[PDB]
Amino acid sequence: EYQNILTGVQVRTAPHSAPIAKGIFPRLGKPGFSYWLGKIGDAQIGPIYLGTTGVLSLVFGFFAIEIIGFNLLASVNWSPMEFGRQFFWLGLEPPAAEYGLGFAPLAEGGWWQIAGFFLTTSILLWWVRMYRRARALKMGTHTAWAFASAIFLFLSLGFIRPLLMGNFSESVPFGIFPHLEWTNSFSLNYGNFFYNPFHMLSIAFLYGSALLFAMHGATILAVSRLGGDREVEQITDRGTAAERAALFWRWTMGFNATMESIHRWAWWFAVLCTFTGAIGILLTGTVVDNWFEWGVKHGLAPAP
Amino acid sequence: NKGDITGYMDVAQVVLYAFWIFFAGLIIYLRREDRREGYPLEDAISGKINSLQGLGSVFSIARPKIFKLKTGATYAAPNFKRDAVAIKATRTAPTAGAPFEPTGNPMTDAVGPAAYALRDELPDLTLGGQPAIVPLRVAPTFSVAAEDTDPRGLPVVDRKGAVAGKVTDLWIDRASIAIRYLEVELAATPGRKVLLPFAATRINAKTKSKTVTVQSILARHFANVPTIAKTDSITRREEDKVMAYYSSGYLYSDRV
Amino acid sequence: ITEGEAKEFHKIFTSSILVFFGVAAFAHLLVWIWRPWVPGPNGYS
Amino acid sequence: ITEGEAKEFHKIFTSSILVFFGVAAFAHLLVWIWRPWVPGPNGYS
Amino acid sequence: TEGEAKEFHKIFTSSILVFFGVAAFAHLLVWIWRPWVPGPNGYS
Amino acid sequence: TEGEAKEFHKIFTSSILVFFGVAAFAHLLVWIWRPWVPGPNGYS
Amino acid sequence: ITEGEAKEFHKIFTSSILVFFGVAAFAHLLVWIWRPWVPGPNGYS
Amino acid sequence: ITEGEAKEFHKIFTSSILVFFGVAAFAHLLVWIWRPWVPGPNGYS
Amino acid sequence: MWRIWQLFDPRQALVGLATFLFVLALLIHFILLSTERFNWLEGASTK
Amino acid sequence: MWRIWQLFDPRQALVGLATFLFVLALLIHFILLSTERFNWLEGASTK
Amino acid sequence: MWRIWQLFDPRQALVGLATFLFVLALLIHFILLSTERFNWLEGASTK
Amino acid sequence: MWRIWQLFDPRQALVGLATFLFVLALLIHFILLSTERFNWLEGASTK
Amino acid sequence: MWRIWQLFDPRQALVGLATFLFVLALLIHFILLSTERFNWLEGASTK
Amino acid sequence: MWRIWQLFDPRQALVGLATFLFVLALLIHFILLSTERFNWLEGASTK
Amino acid sequence: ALLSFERKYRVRGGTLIGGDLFDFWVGPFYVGFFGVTTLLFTVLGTALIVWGAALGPSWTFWQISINPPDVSYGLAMAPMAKGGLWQIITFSAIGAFVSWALREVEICRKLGIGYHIPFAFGFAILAYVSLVVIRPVMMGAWGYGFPYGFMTHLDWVSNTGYQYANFHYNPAHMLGITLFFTTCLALALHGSLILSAANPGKGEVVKGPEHENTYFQDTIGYSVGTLGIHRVGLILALSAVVWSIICMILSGPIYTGSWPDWWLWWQKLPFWNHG
Numbered sequence A: 001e002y003q004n005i006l007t008g009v010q011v012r013t014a015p016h017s018a019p020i021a022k023g024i025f026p027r028l029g030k031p032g033f034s035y036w037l038g039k040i041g042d043a044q045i046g047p048i049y050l051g052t053t054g055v056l057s058l059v060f061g062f063f064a065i066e067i068i069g070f071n072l073l074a075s076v077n078w079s080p081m082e083f084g085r086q087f088f089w090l091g092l093e094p095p096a097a098e099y100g101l102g103f104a105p106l107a108e109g110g111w112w113q114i115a116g117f118f119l120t121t122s123i124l125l126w127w128v129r130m131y132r133r134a135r136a137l138k139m140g141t142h143t144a145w146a147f148a149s150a151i152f153l154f155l156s157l158g159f160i161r162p163l164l165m166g167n168f169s170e171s172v173p174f175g176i177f178p179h180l181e182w183t184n185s186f187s188l189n190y191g192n193f194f195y196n197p198f199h200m201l202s203i204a205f206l207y208g209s210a211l212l213f214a215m216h217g218a219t220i221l222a223v224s225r226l227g228g229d230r231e232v233e234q235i236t237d238r239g240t241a242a243e244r245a246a247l248f249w250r251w252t253m254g255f256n257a258t259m260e261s262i263h264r265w266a267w268w269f270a271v272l273c274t275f276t277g278a279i280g281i282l283l284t285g286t287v288v289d290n291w292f293e294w295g296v297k298h299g300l301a302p303a304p
Numbered sequence B: 001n002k003g004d005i006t007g008y009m010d011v012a013q014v015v016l017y018a019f020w021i022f023f024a025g026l027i028i029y030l031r032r033e034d035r036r037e038g039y040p041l042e043d044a045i046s047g048k049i050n051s052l053q054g055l056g057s058v059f060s061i062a063r064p065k066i067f068k069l070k071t072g073a074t075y076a077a078p079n080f081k082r083d084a085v086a087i088k089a090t091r092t093a094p095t096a097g098a099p100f101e102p103t104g105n106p107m108t109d110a111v112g113p114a115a116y117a118l119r120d121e122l123p124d125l126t127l128g129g130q131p132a133i134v135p136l137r138v139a140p141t142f143s144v145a146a147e148d149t150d151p152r153g154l155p156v157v158d159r160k161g162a163v164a165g166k167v168t169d170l171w172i173d174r175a176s177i178a179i180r181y182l183e184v185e186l187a188a189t190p191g192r193k194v195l196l197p198f199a200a201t202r203i204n205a206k207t208k209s210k211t212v213t214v215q216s217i218l219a220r221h222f223a224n225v226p227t228i229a230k231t232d233s234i235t236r237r238e239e240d241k242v243m244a245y246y247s248s249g250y251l252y253s254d255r256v
Numbered sequence C, D, G, H: 001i002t003e004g005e006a007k008e009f010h011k012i013f014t015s016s017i018l019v020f021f022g023v024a025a026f027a028h029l030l031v032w033i034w035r036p037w038v039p040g041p042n043g044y045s
Numbered sequence E, F: 001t002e003g004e005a006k007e008f009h010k011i012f013t014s015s016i017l018v019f020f021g022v023a024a025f026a027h028l029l030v031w032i033w034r035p036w037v038p039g040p041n042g043y044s
Numbered sequence I, J, K, L, M, N: 001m002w003r004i005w006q007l008f009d010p011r012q013a014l015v016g017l018a019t020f021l022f023v024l025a026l027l028i029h030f031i032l033l034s035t036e037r038f039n040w041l042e043g044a045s046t047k
Numbered sequence O: 001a002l003l004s005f006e007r008k009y010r011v012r013g014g015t016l017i018g019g020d021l022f023d024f025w026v027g028p029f030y031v032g033f034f035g036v037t038t039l040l041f042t043v044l045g046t047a048l049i050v051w052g053a054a055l056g057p058s059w060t061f062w063q064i065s066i067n068p069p070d071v072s073y074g075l076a077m078a079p080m081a082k083g084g085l086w087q088i089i090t091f092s093a094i095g096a097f098v099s100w101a102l103r104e105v106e107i108c109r110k111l112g113i114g115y116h117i118p119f120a121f122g123f124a125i126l127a128y129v130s131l132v133v134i135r136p137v138m139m140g141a142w143g144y145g146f147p148y149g150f151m152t153h154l155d156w157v158s159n160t161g162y163q164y165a166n167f168h169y170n171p172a173h174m175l176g177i178t179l180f181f182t183t184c185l186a187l188a189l190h191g192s193l194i195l196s197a198a199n200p201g202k203g204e205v206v207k208g209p210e211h212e213n214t215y216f217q218d219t220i221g222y223s224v225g226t227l228g229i230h231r232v233g234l235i236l237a238l239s240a241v242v243w244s245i246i247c248m249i250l251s252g253p254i255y256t257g258s259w260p261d262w263w264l265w266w267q268k269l270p271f272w273n274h275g
Ligand code: 07D
Pocket: A065, A119, A123, A150, A151, A153, A154, A157, A174, A182, A183, A184, A186, A187, A192, A193, A194, A198, A199, A202, A203, A204, A206, A273, A274, A276, A277, A278, A280, A281, O157, O181, O184
């Protein structure tokens, strides 16, 4: 009874990759092989492409990470021991309300603003990198727009809502426990963030993404004895694996997808999980002061 | 008050209803994409184009999108190429919901879990315009990685323990580096050679000796495995046929 | 199924309809005698 | 479907639907007698 | 197809006239019970 | 076989009667212990 | 589609949209008589 | 697409858009008669 | 009217109609049960 | 009406009907047990 | 308008109309039930 | 203007237009129901 | 300016233009509804 | 009911009835244990 | 009513229970014995939910709630009016879920595919059971299950989360959140890669597995593979559910205190316990 959960016998060949124009930068990384990764998936590692947008994104991101880490280490007076003790509790806090959207003093949130700007720039440059890498390989840019949804949520959390409130004071800090505490206090300040309906939609789409990527993973693993793992080939030439995958769900559920359209569902659930989340974040504080009172007004709560 | 639009209606509610409209449209779009294979629906008995469908029918089926291949080929989705109503089976009851009694050996008649899609007779292509599923003999560069049992020469047995045959060669996918098939020479017929999918094997590297076992079909069922033509490059239809035959074992491996 | 065996099954099916309905009617009569379930204008009791 | 059975099926359907409608109408009449469901311009006094 | 288009349209018109007639009778009865167009002073 | 159906029906109806008899005896024992049909004023 | 059937469809569509717009305008006039929706300098009342 | 209808579309388009604007501007004029949307130095009213 | 069975299969029409009628009856019965006036089990006075 | 068994196979429609009847009976019993007058185990007084 | 059946199959139009009007009847009835005036089950006073 | 139907399937155009018009009508009706003045079911006074 | 349709498909461009104009009009209407001065449903005073 | 087992598998029927009867008896026993009067383990007073 | 390829796999057999009695289809659905049983449990549970809505004060779909019995009843069966209805709905839901999974098993056997899908659904069933059976039994009362209501089960989630004063600090909860977010990210990447390979643009012939591998080799530096991605995705979702179950068993049955100050153990390891 085999399951295609682990690859008992592996194959290793001469590393090769799809052809790209040389460009200013070559492929970098001297590809190698790994055993556990080949047990769970492919064994080859790299090479990683590092173009102009890749260099720009890496430099901006590294600057942001170094600024954040330097501030975290400085907050505990440069003690490696006490840095270890408080690492989770350490955080680069955003500037206070009084400074508006302008530059705060470095100790009072200027470093947070500089780090956030550099991180935003690196994330956007990484988005451009995904777009350009997809276009270079003569492929579509679905990954870029799926990423753009996540960037929308990130910018709504960090920049857009501060713009609307005219204030970075309620932005999320750069810390492990501090950003969870920001989540908790954001929910408390605005009345039981469960009563945010776009939060409910985002949770529905997150649950649906997990559900869908368990359903689809189990379906492809169930038809992997029939060439079902080779999804694009079953999309261009429908084999019996795709037919049985469709008929299983048609018989158990009443309807079914295509090998191509199931990944459209997969794309859209993931994208909507963050799109509705960004909308719900942009709506709180600006339009809806208290989500519990909005729910009471609109029939979500028994009106105490 | 601050966020209202008309008395009871406010901005958050309006954006919510806008999302609901967008999600209804998105569900329609996704269902249109779903209805790109196997559509339109046929009658369960006669096979005429019929189904309990409303005003959404005009929007149910999308125009055929065109897939371009790196050979000049083209696929149309949906292509309204359907299966024949008359299959090698008979209705248990004439009620359009009843299942089918096979009218023969369903292993070799391609009925039920043995049924295979009527694909095209072309091997999968690599980036270089060559077959992807090839035996290791005609791919000198490819080799089996170490730290894994080499499945060459190991006895091929069923669940009952009878030695169905012996493995001589491995067939692998060039596009994705992994073993696809084991070439098995029959202990009962040297002049016969069969392909057994790698997904249907247990490694069995931890026992008294090393052997390859199959839990689906019995030893005698290896005498009727579908054959292939080129013996060094296998078409999509041939591989789909072989995989369907092997997958049919679990349902009726002991007669019908 | 044929047109004759359908009638043959319908006979025993009708017999079971009558038996089930009679038992249920007796049950409802007993419950009504115990506690009626149609309230009056002033309620119950 | 074969039209040779539509004549029979529609007559059975009509008889059964009139039976069902009449039973429902008698039940509604009984409920209205017990308690009408259309208030006057004062409520349910 | 025009083979049964005329007769289906005739039966459809008969059915939809029956539907609208009974719905209008229902609305008339509802209006006699309680009108749904408030006056300048609301409901009284 | 067809005779096996008759033999199964005989043994099954014997089991039906014995099971229902023991169930009725148990219900009668419980009813003597505590009846489950309350009066107009309740049990007490 | 051919041009003749397009012209016929356009004629029927024009008549239908004329009837729809006339009935909708009639409904709007009745609603305006009931309660106009354009307020004045002081509002509605 | 062939030029033979590039004008055939355009002649309709450049007319239809005009009609659209000819309606929309009209609407705006009415709104300006009702409530102008350009405040003065002391604000609205 | 009998031409409706030249559009719709009678077996599936019967099963779907039975299901719809049963669900509707359950709904109306439950709605009446939640109603103060028409709950024949709780049986509050209508006066 | 004897023809209904041409539309529905007795061997399976009978069992489905038995299941539906059991569900309905058990639901009605649960509803009665949920009430205050028709709960024969609580036995609350009508007066 | 007898020609619209060249565009719309009578089965499709009929099923769609059945479903749409059932949903609309449910919606209007539920809106009436949520109103103080036209809820015929609690029968609240007009004045 | 009769040429638009050469661009669009009349079935597509008609069904899409009916859908859009019904959804818009529902939207407008609900917006009026949300107002204090144009809600015809509670019927708040003009004054 | 009639060569624009040699670049843009008249059907796709017309559909996109219609949808964009509808969303823009809807947004402008809701923006006016949000404002006090131009909300025609409450009808607040200019002063 | 002469030979009803020429239609129903005696093994499947026996297993299904055993499971159904066990589940129903467990449900009734738990319902009695939920009560105040027929909980033979708590043993409350009839008077 | 059949797909273009459906009237080829509609063979009998593959049923665990029922023989040929329920081996048939109704419309698109396969019924089987376990389809009958899931109808039995679903109809009864939904009818009981609607009955509890009738007993409730709202009929507002989001304010309809079925509450479990008060904790003062312990693990006892409760009267149907007050707590028992929630218990019967719980049992009916468990039976319906099990029937659903078993019917999926029969469909898998009939189509001759692996049983991965019912096994994966077993984890969702286990999460529900842990929320309504296992955890309430360990905690000693049925009132620790969540109410069956749209917004009221969210009130339960919030109340139980703030019972430990910050439920984020539950480390198993952190790990489950990490797995859920990673599952969503991996699903986005996988759907995007498949769509981009299948729909590469104007011209742009359909790309092969090598192009898909090359994309993530260039962008990330590693590519899992068109088979291994479904593996890792199923494992990600199942592990997220497993760690959520673990974090809910840890809260109440095992840990009955503030999760935030559970982490003081970390603060006081001997190589930085400055004191
Ligand atoms: C007490 C807390 C309170 C409580 C009531 C509660 C409970 C629950 N919630 Mg919630 N939540 C509350 C608050 C709250 N909640 C959210 C969000 C969500 C979404 C996130 C989706 C996602 O993927 O995010 C995650 C995606 C992001 C943030 C966007 C993409 C991120 C990117 C590209 C970052 C790129 C990073 C690098 C390149 C690395 C280098 C950088 C550095 C080193 C610095 C999701 C659906 C979700 C789930 C649940 C569940 C399941 C529950 C349960 C069971 O109770 N919550 C966010 C949101 O969208 O809200 C609308 C948000 O902002 C916010 C707030 C304030």
